[PDB]
Amino acid sequence: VLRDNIQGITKPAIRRLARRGGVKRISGLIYEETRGVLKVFLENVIRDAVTYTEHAKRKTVTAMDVVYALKRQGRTLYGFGG
Template sequence: MSGRGNGTKGVDQGGSKRRRLILRENIQSISRQSIRRLARRVGVTKTVTIVDVVYTLKRQGRTIYGFGK
């Protein structure tokens, strides 16, 4: 066992690796903030914290100081 996948052989060797690379690139291009925004729109998080308000104001160009990080 060399630890390099599931040991497929034949013509289609490496197809899953390519798919995995494309998926990883797509996932890495999504920022954490956009995931948070989508979750808020879908209704996953129902509590709005001070950090959320500060973040939204910062996105709109109205930075507020004294809160958050």
């Protein structure tokens, strides 16, 4: 019963996110569209965090790596250091 990791972001999970976003009714094609959007979001952020890891010559991505990555994508996060 093999499955893509992206598909692990399930319809009901996406449905909950939408709900917190105040969405009442959801078209069927939205779930695939959302997974795509998340994938681009994560690629851009992880790419940058990993760049921060490599520069530091570590093999572990630290929270700070991510926080720095977020800060420079203009999506500042509070709660994880820095």
